[PDB]
Scaffold this active site. Structure first.
Site, PDB file in Angstrom:
ATOM      1  N   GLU A 123       0.859  -1.175   0.000  1.00 28.73           N
ATOM      2  CA  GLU A 123       0.000   0.000   0.000  1.00 28.73           C
ATOM      3  C   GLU A 123       0.890   1.218   0.000  1.00 28.73           C
ATOM      4  O   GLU A 123       1.848   1.292   0.776  1.00 28.73           O
ATOM      5  CB  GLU A 123      -0.884   0.023   1.240  1.00 28.73           C
ATOM      6  CG  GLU A 123      -1.835   1.202   1.307  1.00 28.73           C
ATOM      7  CD  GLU A 123      -2.706   1.166   2.549  1.00 28.73           C
ATOM      8  OE1 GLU A 123      -2.484   0.283   3.394  1.00 28.73           O
ATOM      9  OE2 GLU A 123      -3.614   2.013   2.691  1.00 28.73           O
ATOM     10  N   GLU A 207      -9.492   9.853   6.073  1.00 27.64           N
ATOM     11  CA  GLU A 207      -9.770   8.852   7.082  1.00 27.64           C
ATOM     12  C   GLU A 207     -10.081   9.557   8.402  1.00 27.64           C
ATOM     13  O   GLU A 207      -9.172  10.048   9.070  1.00 27.64           O
ATOM     14  CB  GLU A 207      -8.555   7.934   7.257  1.00 27.64           C
ATOM     15  CG  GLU A 207      -8.200   7.126   6.021  1.00 27.64           C
ATOM     16  CD  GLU A 207      -6.929   6.296   6.202  1.00 27.64           C
ATOM     17  OE1 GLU A 207      -5.900   6.830   6.663  1.00 27.64           O
ATOM     18  OE2 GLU A 207      -6.967   5.097   5.887  1.00 27.64           O
TER      19      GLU A 207
END
Length: 226
Positions: A123, A207
């Site tokens: 990621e 987030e």
């Protein structure tokens, strides 16, 4: 009264698509971890994406509640090293109070082109902002220069997934870049296997942990070329 072209929702997995391959997702995957709500509103999808996420989250102090994001469609997965450029631009602002959240790009890669697109062997995150005591996973690897700008590089593990996070040293509300520069750095300095990893996804959003906030994305563009 009512209106068409209605691209607003507070639904957990609401997704709106349009323009040059853009999808805007509410993606409240961690809504279980708290109390409150998350909504998204798409203003415009054309050559660029314009949209905002509005939310209020309490509880689950240490848990991401969602990743509302914009992303581009990738019908055909390609090898990182074969991709010529991954240009992107982002113009955004955050408002609200007691914000514990970030603003970041998120991409997954794997040696399997049919890997599920929400995880991978790797990621890659590029954080344009961070609020409160929230940060990337892993441990600081030091500062690096990518295309003339400094980033603090973090590196850690989530299960078998390796995660690299490039964090801007201060908030960057207005940015333009090429994700290929970041892959090139990892390839040439970190042994990242660019020749065998496929780009599975290419997202940008926030987030949230707790607080109440509105991420306004005035404009976002991204593409994968050649």
């Amino acid at each position: 009264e009512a209106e068409a072209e209605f691209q607003t929702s507070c639904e957990q997995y609401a997704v709106f698509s349009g323009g040059n391959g853009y999808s805007v997702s509410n993606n409240l995957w961690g809504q279980s971890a708290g109390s409150g709500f998350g909504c998204i509103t798409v203003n415009s999808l054309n050559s660029a994406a314009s949209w905002h996420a509005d939310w209020q989250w309490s509880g689950g102090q240490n848990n991401v509640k969602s990743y509302p994001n914009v992303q581009i469609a990738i019908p055909q997965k390609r090898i990182v090293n074969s991709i010529g450029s991954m240009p992107t631009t982002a113009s955004w602002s955050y408002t609200g109070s007691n914000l514990r959240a970030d603003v970041a790009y998120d991409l997954f890669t794997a040696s399997n082109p049919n890997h599920v697109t929400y995880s991978g062997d790797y990621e890659l995150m590029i954080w344009l902002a961070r609020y409160g005591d929230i940060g990337p996973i892993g441990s600081a690897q030091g500062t690096v220069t990518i295309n003339g700008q400094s980033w603090t590089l973090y590196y850690g593990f989530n299960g078998a997934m390796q995660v690299y996070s490039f964090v801007a040293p201060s908030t960057v509300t207005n940015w333009s870049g090429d994700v290929k520069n970041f892959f090139n750095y990892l390839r040439d300095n970190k042994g990242y296997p660019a020749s065998s990893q496929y780009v599975l996804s290419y997202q940008f959003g926030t987030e949230p942990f707790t607080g109440s906030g509105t991420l306004n994305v005035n404009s976002w563009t991204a593409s994968i070329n050649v």
